[model samples]
Target: APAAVDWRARGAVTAVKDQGQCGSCWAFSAIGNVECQWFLAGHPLTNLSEQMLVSCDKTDSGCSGGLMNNAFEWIVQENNGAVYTEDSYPYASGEGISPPCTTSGHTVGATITGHVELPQDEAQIAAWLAVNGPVAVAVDASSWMTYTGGVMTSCVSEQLDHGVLLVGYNDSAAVPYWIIKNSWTTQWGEEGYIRIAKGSNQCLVKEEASSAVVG
Candidate 1:
């Protein structure tokens, strides 16, 4: 296993499932990023369910694409400033189908964490990751519609894109790449993860600097 890298300033980023056609991609990236930051900020792995941000959180369109900053607002202002875990409420994304808001013991939340805004320049992005740990990012992945392979570096076009969790990095690879946790299931990529070629990645670029909802 690639050793987990921890930056005193960076945080954790987890892969999130974009509810199919639920245009809440921004929310997933926002809440997931914040969820990891919250954990690094002295909280346990308080998995912040993106589903809550997608369904319960007001402000953004539920089944339509939304912005990251707005999602953060919902978490801080409404949800008592806390995010939930996936185990508490598994993700759901099809049209006309929905799941009940989980209300179990562990389903209950712990301390709520604040959110952070991210910077996107090469140096800035690298620095933030080095300091913050993991971060959720958006990218163009339309090409992955039926593709399977090793570390992906080039693409003809960027359309089938989605959100992902940036867990760690490896300088050992032929080219340093960000260890991106993916939601395409464990059967895809490196154990449900993909090595995104570092530096100005289209998938990485789509995530706005304000895309991060940090805690």
Candidate 2:
């Protein structure tokens, strides 16, 4: 097993992606998981497409709302989907209007066989992240609308609404927090990242934690 790790510093985590004003965070979250897993497996970084899910995957609503796990299933099972690169498909939804699904003129850059939901515990989640790169998690991001910096403690544990990726964690910090990659653009939080308090399951992050597995 791999030792304690920081996927960001190790170049496993890709650049933060922007989901814009659309509720397509689920697509971004799913793609981010696959992206990291591919990189950790010694493959070069390939910017996967969230538009493919937003436009094609039927298990979840395109832009209104969705879940990362459903998106994963659609990729591996439903469509036998080969995720296209961002440059090829790009992001076409965000103006509150989801366009029709496009299939022509894109490159199939990557694919995943399946995904696994991580154990619903902080320690177990941390262990998986340290070994397998980032994981997708659902959180109550209602209070995160104004988050700028510092460990977030204002979020209430409620129904998880938003989907984001857990990139890394540091228990050694004065206030232990999990490093998160958000899809709301870099202009929002700390360069599209936020650190939420650990152990307490801040914002219900540990509730729906999951990761994509590459083979």
Candidate 3:
């Protein structure tokens, strides 16, 4: 079945690499957004090379963190984009200074489908997910550094990672869980992602509108 997202209150998510212990958080953010766009538009899953972007993308600071919106703008303008494979891109955990893009694969790929905001209510949130594929949202998941599992009982405006993907929200349980896809490896925190309570913390709703990308 096709998925729909509540544009009024819904957002998007991207499947990205954690870049291991590297400081390439910004690169992953950009890649993840582009990956989601491809998936939603009916494209094969390709592990886009965050390495390439992190290493080559201008104004890039080796790791040290970056904003999701900044990365998106860079991709959309390039026009030559594609989901790179891990085999080719590979993962590095250093300051990310690489040997330079050798494969002559320097071409812009990936663009924006559009942008949307997340819903405040559960019903509206669910409606958005059913229509949209995913949402890229920013939440104050600072506790996520040590956060391991279970629904977010309560959050008080704290965060470590600045970006995440809100794929879906489930209200079947006493507390609704926002299905989030994270860049932290599938081992760091809750299999690399955390399911936060829908309305438990206003901090999670820090970023109002999130965007999506595609090749």
Candidate 4:
């Protein structure tokens, strides 16, 4: 396994984004992974649109709940690898009222060719993240609803309900943990980030790991 990896150290990762009260965490998770891969692919860092998926993607519901796999599939099949930028189509449905889909004249910054699902093992996921980029992962984040800081271990083992970015991991520390980027807000969980035990599958984090492959 790699010694340690932090995508933020190379500026491949972007700032923490807020999903507000919207259950659109899947959008943020998928977008974050894609943005990191796009940057790692030697392209300029671009803030892709979560609002576009929340508002436009038909396969997934907006502001209620969705899946990262469904979002990635929609990008590849329906959106034609074209995703709008945050500036053009800013997020405006945090209040649970999703705005109408807008597809006119918006710029598509990066395109996803397809998505790859990673194995359930933590080491494999870490190796994949070290070589590729951040990964989109689903977890039972009910414990995250009130999390403020520290390594989380209260996650239940069950069907995952929330999506987050698995950005980095550190095994050298006294308590090895996976760096997690959340969508709750910057004010929560270490400025919208959290760390979970590296090998314990805390909160079912390794249940559904995936990443978007940019074309």
TM-score of candidate 2 against the unseen true structure: 0.95
Model 2 pairs in collision: none
TM-score of each: 0.74, 0.95, 0.74, 0.97
How well is each residue in 1-215 modelled by candidate 1, as lDDT tens digits?
33235332243444435456566666666665666666666766655666776667657666566666677767677766666666776568656244444444436443344556676564466567666666666677676655566767764435434666666665667866666666655676666667666665546453455433333
Candidate 1 versus the native: TM-score? 0.74
Selected candidate, larger lDDT, 1 vs 3: 1
Greater lDDT among 3 and 4 belongs to 4
Segments of candidate 1 deviating more than 4 angstroms: 1-24, 87-96, 99-107, 110-113, 156-161, 204-207, 210-215
Q: What's the lDDT for all of these models?
A: 0.59, 0.86, 0.58, 0.88
**Window of ten residues with lowest summed lDDT in model 1:** 2-11
Score candidate 4 by TM-score against the native.
0.97
Q: lDDT order of candidates, best first?
A: 4, 2, 1, 3
Top-lDDT candidate index = 4
Candidate 2 root-mean-square deviation in Å: 1.6
Give per-residue CA lDDT, model 3, range 2-35, as digits (tens). Answer: 2323221423333335665666665665566566
Q: What is the C-alpha RMSD of each candidate to the true structure, in Å?
A: 4.6, 1.6, 5.0, 1.0
